[PDB]
């Protein structure tokens, strides 16, 4: 049974970049809905699993196939929002302060500067043509190299792709404050990105 | 724990339309690989389910998201092939004979002939731009109306769409015999399609 | 060069079901963005097509492939929003009024009633796990039968699937008013659905 | 108008790793079908582009949307197979020989050896659940780093992802010889992979 994570900060602590009103809806409604949905999907799985254990028919297997989609969507929503709240911080807690050490060295070697990496990430975020996410990741299969990937809907990065920074590009992440001006939101969010958490995930 | 279904015919019973060589590989290698993969994926999800119970973190949830792709692909392969073997028959068991009853009535009402429906399905099969399936389905949500749908890979039709005829368009279903001439296989398979089974599925709504 | 269509009503004409603030953004910002994007994508096709004619290399073919996504997305945005505005109307213009004729008869035959069809469509809209659309369509390949289909992003219905009603399930279509309660928006929109335009599409299809 | 490229080797030159029967069908039937399809899709799109120029309706835009799927699939099939033939060579033409220069340096930096890069690529290939490809790529957006990506069907790597080695995982690429034993084919193909072409692509930063 999963639960909404505690937040490290108050709803309004990321203003003016992300409003408190968005945070409260995003956290208490959207995220909570993925929590509930994920729990329901795993219960339904459990039941189907027992059922198939005693009656391993094609019909029952098809029934499981049906639930897989909800496990993926709600699991993805749950995990992605947990990641998101953890890589956000108010400036008083280090939000927007550039990373140090190994991550900073890697960013410098690959992208030239933090500014370049961020510019690339915002171009990726703008390029999500639908609902989705952008992730700065460490690829453990190619020598631990940084990349920026896009996912759609609540798809997430798994296995050898370690998420370092997750940025939400669903319209509900910004619409009440920015409406259609999503570029302004993509630009503004970096002032409250927690690069300390990014460095921790990198380690 | 699922297993390969019993076949209603021997591997060579669909000759010359589908070779015995193909049927033997298709059943004993491909379908068996789906059976194994589905069993493994389901077991792994049980394991991760307990792990998530003990420690309901985003990391463990992430792992479950990883396993669902395998449950979907292998589950889909298992179930789709089961449907497939059940809607094929040799001519001695009614393969290639036209459907009966309400299904035939539906086909006449919607397509005007069985030939129109088969032509539509073959066009759908040719249109699968990859590995996939075509299904003739009964749509339970729109008053039980017949339609033809494509899926890719091992995706299947679920919910309100009841598969009546599954046709496999993965290359392994025909390559040894027809090679690149997939149109010839799509054309030839209708001689061994079991419309008796299709009628049954139509009438049952499952 | 495609352009925004003229709306048959002012932005605030669908209240209280759809805010005028929403319609104004949805039309002037979002849809316009699809118009501009589609024009850009078609011109880029022209350019790459000449490029490919002069040098039909794998590299240039690879560029062609690259533009296809924008063609699909912006083309879809343009088309879908045109359909959308055309099947909405204020109640004063017959919004929410039930369909007549052949469409009405087919609906009764297939779904039992207009209410059952609307419920099915709302279930499909709720089922869009992401941004997307639902369409009520006439299927020309199976004898002209009605169906409800979902699409994601700006994917649309083509070929034998004639769109009769399109409903937008992207958050920008409802968020400023309904926020997370998308089900309330899905339920409310039918009060301004133009079923006469649906009937005309059905007969012409 | 695209055309079937010239091969740099005879159909039976990659035996016993890939049969002559396979290469002949793969080239003269499958790839040719992509050539024909891509030319036809491009023609049809030009036609609809003209019609749209005179009649900019949502209906015509819907027809355009329908065509672009064919442009994607056939364009992909065409490009992916051109890549494929160019990164294959018989052993006497240097197939199976390790890459040199900048590519070799990058490979040893990120993977330690060609060994592990090939192992990674084989796991990716086995992981294609349907028809598709694996590509060893140079990512131009992250400082030029190597990676291995999967695509399904005739999807291809575009933009910052530059294909260095393309391996075909469609069943027609191996079934006549290996049937269901796809891992045997993925293992065997490396004996006739042309790393000199891969190095040329890495150095050039494009195909
Ligand atoms: Mn969100
Ligand atoms: Mn099969
Ligand atoms: Mn919209
Ligand atoms: Mn191929």
UniProtKB/Swiss-Prot annotation, chain B:
Its cofactor is Mn(2+). It is an enzyme of class 1 (oxidoreductase). One of its GO terms (biological process) is reactive oxygen species metabolic process. One of its GO terms (molecular function) is superoxide dismutase activity. InterPro entries: Fe/Mn_Superoxide_Dismutase, Mn/Fe_SOD, Mn/Fe_SOD_BS, Mn/Fe_SOD_C, Mn/Fe_SOD_N, Mn/Fe_SOD_N_sf, SOD_C_sf. SUPFAM superfamilies: Fe,Mn superoxide dismutase (SOD), C-terminal domain, Fe,Mn superoxide dismutase (SOD), N-terminal domain. Mn(2+) binds at residues 26, 81, 168, 172. It catalyses: 2 superoxide + 2 H(+) = H2O2 + O2. Its main location: mitochondrion. Its EC number is 1.15.1.1. GO terms for cellular component: mitochondrial matrix; mitochondrion. The keyword Transit peptide applies. It is found in: Mitochondrion matrix. Signal peptide: none annotated. It comes from the Eukaryota. The modification Phosphothreonine is found at residues 121, 123. Binds 1 Mn(2+) ion per subunit. Keywords: Antioxidant, Manganese, Metal-binding, Mitochondrion, Oxidoreductase, Phosphoprotein, Transit peptide. Homotetramer. Present with 10900 molecules/cell in log phase SD medium. Destroys superoxide anion radicals which are normally produced within the cells and which are toxic to biological systems. Belongs to the iron/manganese superoxide dismutase family. This is Superoxide dismutase [Mn], mitochondrial.
UniProtKB/Swiss-Prot annotation, chain D:
It comes from Saccharomyces cerevisiae (strain ATCC 204508 / S288c). The keyword Manganese applies. It comes from the Eukaryota. Its cofactor is Mn(2+). The lineage of its organism: Eukaryota, Fungi, Dikarya, Ascomycota, Saccharomycotina. It is found in: Mitochondrion matrix. Its EC number is 1.15.1.1. Belongs to the iron/manganese superoxide dismutase family. Gene3D superfamilies: Fe,Mn superoxide dismutase (SOD) domain (1.10.287.990), Iron/manganese superoxide dismutase, C-terminal domain (3.55.40.20). Present with 10900 molecules/cell in log phase SD medium. The modification Phosphothreonine is found at residues 121, 123. One of its GO terms (cellular component) is mitochondrion. This is Superoxide dismutase [Mn], mitochondrial. The keyword Manganese applies. Its main location: mitochondrion. InterPro entries: Fe/Mn_Superoxide_Dismutase (IPR050265), Mn/Fe_SOD (IPR001189), Mn/Fe_SOD_BS (IPR019833), Mn/Fe_SOD_C (IPR019832), Mn/Fe_SOD_N (IPR019831), Mn/Fe_SOD_N_sf (IPR036324), SOD_C_sf (IPR036314). It catalyses: 2 superoxide + 2 H(+) = H2O2 + O2. Destroys superoxide anion radicals which are normally produced within the cells and which are toxic to biological systems. It holds the Pfam family Sod_Fe_C. Keywords: Antioxidant, Manganese, Metal-binding, Mitochondrion, Oxidoreductase, Phosphoprotein, Transit peptide. Binds 1 Mn(2+) ion per subunit. One of its GO terms (biological process) is reactive oxygen species metabolic process. Mn(2+) binds at residues 26, 81, 168, 172. Homotetramer. One of its GO terms (molecular function) is manganese ion binding.
């Amino acid at each position: 049974k999963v639960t909404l994570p505690d937040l490290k900060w108050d709803f309004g602590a990321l203003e003016p970049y992300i409003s408190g009103q968005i945070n409260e809806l995003h956290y208490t409604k959207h995220h909570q809905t993925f929590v509930n949905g994920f729990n329901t999907a795993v219960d339904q799985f459990q039941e189907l699993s027992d059922l198939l254990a005693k009656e391993p028919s094609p019909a029952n297997a098809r029934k499981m196939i049906a639930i897989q989609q909800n496990i993926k969507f709600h699991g993805g929503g749950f995990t992605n929002h947990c990641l998101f709240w953890e890589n956000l911080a108010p400036e008083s807690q280090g939000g927007g302060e550039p990373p140090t050490g190994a991550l900073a060295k890697a960013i410098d070697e690959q992208f030239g500067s933090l500014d370049e990496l961020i510019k690339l990430t915002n171009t990726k975020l703008a390029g999500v043509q639908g609902s989705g996410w952008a992730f700065i990741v460490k690829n453990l299969s190619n020598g631990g190299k940084l990349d920026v990937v896009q996912t759609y809907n609540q798809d997430t990065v798994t296995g050898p792709l370690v998420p370092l920074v997750a940025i939400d590009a669903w319209e509900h992440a910004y619409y009440l404050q920015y409406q259609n001006k999503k570029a302004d939101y993509f630009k503004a969010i970096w002032n409250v990105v927690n690069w300390k958490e990014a460095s921790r995930r990198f380690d």
